[PDB]
């Protein structure tokens, strides 16, 4: 339960009621992207204590163009897209070094994709928080693939965008004096960051106040 | 007069019309409405305002329209009070009417006021002739004349009437409630004797009988007694009813009825009070005649000529409270403008200006005025934009002299504050000349001076050239904006312009300490907070 | 007035008595009452015993000239509010003293004032602050020139303790920080007042043992 803060003690208190900038339509979401078009994502309705709320998540957000077969070891060109990307399904990771190779769409290339969950009626210039981490090998039928970062998202009021970067010889492998020079995924993750810097002001966030998160070993990555 | 003692809220007391209702219906000001329906259904009778009974002589008869839009202060004389066939039957005139309601139709052939008196119908044919009488010879005075003589159908009779022709005179209920000098005989009637009306048709009877009688005074206290006298050569009328001059204070020692209800007193329009000879007649001519005013009498330098250019005639929309009083010019001419400033002297308060004209010299006409100065917020120094509103144009102005005593009447706060937006500017004075300590000493005497003002504006007018020291008296604080309670962070309230200069020690917008009571009476039109451009809705959650 | 006396002296300290509030009451007993609180002293707001007229006292009984009027006053003002009103009214020295945030005299004042035309008088301050928008001390010195800081500390009603803290500061030494915000409308809220203050206070630290203006 949520009380207003006030300075001083008052006899009649009004106060304009919440907007959402996200277009729902048939009870899903959906965001204007300024260059590219729309995006169409998921309503979840999440309970805390005995309480619930509504949080419109966004799972399978791209951010740079795949790298495959022959952008491997590169850096990473923005990919140019125009129409209504279906952002309700999460997509794979990167290829972690050490891995079962269970049959899945868990772990693979083509792995640079966002997951942003925003609460139903954020604050009007609501913080990011950009977590960056590539899942293991689990079975993404039930969705949210080891991060649901929509309850911090419900239970602190605050958007959360969770990222995927090429870690391992895919994301560190250099040779040579020059163009094999080395830090893609660090160049995977500026560029995640520079996205979520340009785009996150349709979503209610405030591109000013993104705060960066990693953990165990990709903090090692994160504090360059 | 609450029907229980519970008494939840000020909306559950109730009007005299909507406590008792047995078929009654009441307006929105809570009084009866004109027309009443009969009976439930049925035709319509049109009631006293005060009273929830009919005048049923009226129109109690004809099962008939609604909508009574014009006011039957005419009586339906009974048989009793009425002679016929005296030896005098000359009607003045009667129109045929076209029988659809004819007793209508003679009603609104008498809302003129002329000569009319009364009405005969005759129903013996089926044209109905509205034979109708005059103010002429023919306590318990009848209709002392009728033309007919076999059938008897009743005669009406006007009352209270405004404006009245009796065939030697021109009488007009003139609004001023009391008389200064000038009475043959005030004669009391019994309180059940008349009922305002047969008093009213006696002393005009009695003055258009007699000659020179330019009017008559007549009241009713609520003790029931009835008073009547008959003017000749009053000197000046005074209080009129429709002035600010109740100040909400006990009397003094007597200032208008000066008998401690209903006063009125009527004037003969075309009198001949000037070219009335002394000699003939000697009706009273005697009136005092005061000596003349010597010069070392009166100096008259309290008071300023004002240039009627300034002066811009609003009558339509303008509501200064104010006062007339009446000369008479049989004696009083180019004296009147000293005897007015006298009495502009005489009344301390609510006297901050002066007014001087004629209508069509049996009238002099003086109007005691408060201070009607209209400022626009434009909010300069120079003061020439600061414009009066007056009902008509004047002939003759006078300003009183500003006094400044020697010590300050309050502990004067500084508000917090640096912006308005509803401000009502009444004196712009430039105190550029003098110092800061001085000059503000000078403008808090100004407000002082001042009863309506609310508030005094010190500050720097105009800085894009140096500085203007000036002093703005306020008669309404408004929106006060841009505090240092936040301490200049996230200010979303715009603060003041870069010319105004408000900020520093000894400027910076004073608050007269509040005054419990209330603001005084007769304070110009009551100030309204800055108009919202748009219309708030209710989609707030509350 | 001092020079009486309750009519029975005893031996040693009496056990209690009666203030001039009490006493003035019983003098009037024996109309308007003087209405006072539990202790010694006059309630700030006196109002006559029909409740039509009410005014300021300040514990001793005569009365603040503004501050009559029917029924009850709020916003009582003190005795810095006073006098401060009062120097812009004619009262001689005309440099305002340091007044705290409600209507209290800072305990540590200065004149600030002295050899303004080569003559010791002060200066007049409260005219000298406005036309000329000092905030820097060299731009101060450039301006007015042979003026120096005379600092002290006030008594509770603002009396100048007698032969103590009648310190002068010279106004050369310090190079000023802080030059880039707007005029703060009051001397007391310029900064160069608590240059003075702290200057002032740093001088007593070393006397008296204490850093401070020693209370009542
Ligand atoms: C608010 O308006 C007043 C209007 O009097 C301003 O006072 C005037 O301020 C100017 C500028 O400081 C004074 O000019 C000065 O004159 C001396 C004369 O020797 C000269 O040496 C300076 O260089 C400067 O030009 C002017 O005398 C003064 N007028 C007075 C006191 O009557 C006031 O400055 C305005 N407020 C602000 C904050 O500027
Ligand atoms: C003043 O008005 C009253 C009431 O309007 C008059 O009283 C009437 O008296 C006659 C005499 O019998 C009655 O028949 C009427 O019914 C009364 N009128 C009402 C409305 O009840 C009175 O005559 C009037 N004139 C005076 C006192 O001179
Ligand atoms: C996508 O199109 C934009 C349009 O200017 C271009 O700059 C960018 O290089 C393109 N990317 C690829 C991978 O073709
Ligand atoms: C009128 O009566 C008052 C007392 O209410 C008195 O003060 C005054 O002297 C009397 N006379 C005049 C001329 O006002
Ligand atoms: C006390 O002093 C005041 C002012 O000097 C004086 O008016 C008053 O009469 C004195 N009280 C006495 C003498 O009892």
Request: charged residues 20%.
């Amino acid at each position: 339960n949520c009380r207003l803060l006030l300075r001083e003690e008052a006899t009649h208190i009004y106060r304009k009621p919440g907007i959402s900038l996200l277009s729902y339509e048939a009870s899903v979401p959906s965001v204007p992207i300024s260059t590219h078009g729309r995006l169409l994502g998921r309503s979840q309705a999440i309970q805390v204590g005995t309480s619930w709320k509504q949080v419109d998540q966004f799972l399978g957000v791209p951010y740079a163009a795949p790298p495959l077969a022959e952008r491997r070891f590169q850096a990473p060109e923005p990919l140019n897209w125009t129409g209504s990307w279906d952002a309700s399904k999460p997509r794979a990771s990167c290829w972690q070094p050490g891995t079962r190779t269970s049959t899945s769409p868990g772990v693979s290339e083509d792995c640079l994709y966002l997951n942003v969950f925003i609460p139903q009626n954020v604050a009007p210039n609501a913080s990011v928080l950009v977590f960056f981490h590539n899942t293991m090998d689990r079975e993404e039928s039930e969705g949210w693939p080891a991060i649901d970062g929509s309850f911090l998202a419900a239970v602190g009021n605050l958007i959360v965008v969770t990222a995927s970067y090429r870690v391992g010889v895919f994301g560190f492998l250099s040779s040579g004096s020059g163009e094999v020079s080395g830090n893609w995924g660090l160049l995977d993750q500026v560029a995640a960051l520079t996205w979520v810097q340009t785009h996150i002001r349709g979503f209610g966030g405030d591109p000013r106040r993104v705060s960066l998160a990693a953990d165990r070993g990709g903090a090692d990555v994160a504090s360059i | 007069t609450t029907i229980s003692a519970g008494a939840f809220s000020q909306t559950h007391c109730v009007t005299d019309c909507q406590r008792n209702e047995a078929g009654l219906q009441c307006d929105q000001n809570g009084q009866y409405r004109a027309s009443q329906k009969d009976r439930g259904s049925g035709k319509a009778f049109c009631v006293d305002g005060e009273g929830r009974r009919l005048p049923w002589w009226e129109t109690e008869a004809p099962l008939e329209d609604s909508q009574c839009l014009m006011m039957q202060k005419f009586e339906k004389v009974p048989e009793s009070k009425v002679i016929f066939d005296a030896n005098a039957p000359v009607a003045v005139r009667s129109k045929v009417p076209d029988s659809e309601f004819p007793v209508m139709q003679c009603l609104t052939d008498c809302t003129e006021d002329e000569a009319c008196s009364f009405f005969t119908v005759s129903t013996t044919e089926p044209e109905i002739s509205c034979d109708f009488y005059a103010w002429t010879s023919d306590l318990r005075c009848q209709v002392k004349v009728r033309s007919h003589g076999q059938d008897s159908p009743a005669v009406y009779l006007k009352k209270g009437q405004g404006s009245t022709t009796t065939l030697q005179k021109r009488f007009e209920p003139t609004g001023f409630q009391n008389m200064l000098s000038g009475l043959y005989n005030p004669i009391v009637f019994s309180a059940s004797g008349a009922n305002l009306t047969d008093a009213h048709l006696f002393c005009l009877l009695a003055c258009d009988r007699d000659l020179c009688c330019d009017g008559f005074v007549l009241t009713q206290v609520q003790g029931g007694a009835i008073i009547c006298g008959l003017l000749s050569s009053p000197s000046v009328l005074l209080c009129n009813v429709k002035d600010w001059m109740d100040p909400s204070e006990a009397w003094a020692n007597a200032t208008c009825p000066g008998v401690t209800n209903f006063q009125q007193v009527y004037l003969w329009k075309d009198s001949d009070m000037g070219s009335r000879p002394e000699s003939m007649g000697c009706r009273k001519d005697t009136v005092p005649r005061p000596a003349s005013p010597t010069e070392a009498g009166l100096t008259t330098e309290l008071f300023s000529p004002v240039d009627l250019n300034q002066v811009i005639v609003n009558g339509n929309q303008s509501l200064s409270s104010q006062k007339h009083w009446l000369f008479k010019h049989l004696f009083s001419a180019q004296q009147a403008n000293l005897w007015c400033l006298s009495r502009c002297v005489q009344e301390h308060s609510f006297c901050q200006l002066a007014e001087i004209t004629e209508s069509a010299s049996l009238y002099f006409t003086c109007t005691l005025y408060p201070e009607a100065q209209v400022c626009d917020d434009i909010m300069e120094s120079n003061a020439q934009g600061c414009r009066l509103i007056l009902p008509q144009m004047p002939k003759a102005l006078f300003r009183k002299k500003v006094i400044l005593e020697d010590k300050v009447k309050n502990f004067y706060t500084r508000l917090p504050f640096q912006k308005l937006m509803g401000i009502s500017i009444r004196n712009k004075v430039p105190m550029s000349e003098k110092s800061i300590s001085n000059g503000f000493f000078e403008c808090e005497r100004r407000c002082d001076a001042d009863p309506c003002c609310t508030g005094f504006g010190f500050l720097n007018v105009s800085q894009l050239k140096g500085g203007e020291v000036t002093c703005l008296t306020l008669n309404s604080l408004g929106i006060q904006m841009c505090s240092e309670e936040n301490g200049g962070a996230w200010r979303i309230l715009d603060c003041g312009s870069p010319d105004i200069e408000v900020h520093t020690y000894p400027f910076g917008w004073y608050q007269k300490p509040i005054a419990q009571n209330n603001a005084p009476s007769f304070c110009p039109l009551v100030v309204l907070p800055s108009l919202t451009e748009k219309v708030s809705l209710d989609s707030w959650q509350s | 007035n001092g020079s009486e006396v309750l009519g029975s002296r005893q031996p040693g300290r009496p056990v209690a008595c009666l203030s001039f509030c009490q006493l003035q009451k019983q003098q009037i007993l024996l109309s308007y009452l003087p209405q006072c609180q539990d202790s010694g002293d006059y309630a700030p707001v006196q109002c006559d015993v029909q409740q039509v007229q009410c005014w300021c006292v300040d514990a001793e009984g005569m009365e603040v000239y503004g501050t009559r009027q029917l029924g009850r006053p709020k916003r009582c003002p003190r005795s810095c509010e006073i006098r401060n009103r009062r120097l812009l009214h004619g009262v001689g020295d005309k440099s305002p003293p340091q007044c705290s945030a409600e209507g209290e005299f800072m305990p540590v004042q200065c004149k600030f004032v002295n050899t303004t035309d080569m003559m010791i008088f002060d200066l007049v301050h409260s005219y000298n602050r406005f036309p000329d928008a000092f905030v820097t001390f060299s731009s101060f010195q450039r301006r007015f020139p042979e003026v120096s800081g005379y600092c002290h500390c006030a008594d509770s009603q603002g009396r100048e303790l007698a032969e103590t803290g009648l310190e002068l500061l010279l106004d050369e030494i310090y190079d000023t920080i802080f030059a880039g915000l707007d005029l703060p409308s009051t001397f007391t809220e310029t900064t160069l007042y608590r240059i003075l203050q702290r200057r002032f206070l740093a001088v007593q630290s070393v006397i008296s043992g204490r850093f401070r203006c020693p209370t009542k």
